[PDB]
Amino acid sequence: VDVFIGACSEPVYRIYNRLQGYIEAVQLQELRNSIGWLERLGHRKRITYSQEVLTDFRRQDTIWVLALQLPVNPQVVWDVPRSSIANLIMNIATCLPTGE
């Protein structure tokens, strides 16, 4: 990277110094966790996931950006008050098979 010294307002730089703090955390221990969790998931649900995007010939100089993280803390879905029916209907519509 090329660091330098410039000028910015006070509550605008507070967001920029937090955004780049998140891209630094994608490189070290969050791209290796979201990929490393899907492999533990498709081993169970029999869904072969592809890692085709991490493996071209320009993979050395490439900054990855991941706006989402995969190991979902499942308590935040079950903290919605009296949400035991929408978690049954959304489980049926997403994952139920279909057969004769």
């Binding site: 085709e52 995007v53 071209d56 010939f57 320009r58």
Partner: protein
């Protein structure tokens, strides 16, 4: 003209399926590296 290529048994004598030469795989290996980097640069920002 080599003593290895002598076949004395009908076991290493099958069909001929396809052929591959020297300068065919060299253009093919370059055409499959750039195609793999032109694909994933057109699917993501």
């Amino acid at each position: 003209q080599r003593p290895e290529r002598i076949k004395t048994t009908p076991y290493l004598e099958g069909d001929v399926l396809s052929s591959d030469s020297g300068p065919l795989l060299s253009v093919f290996a370059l055409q499959e590296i750039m195609q793999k980097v032109r694909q994933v640069q057109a699917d993501y920002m």
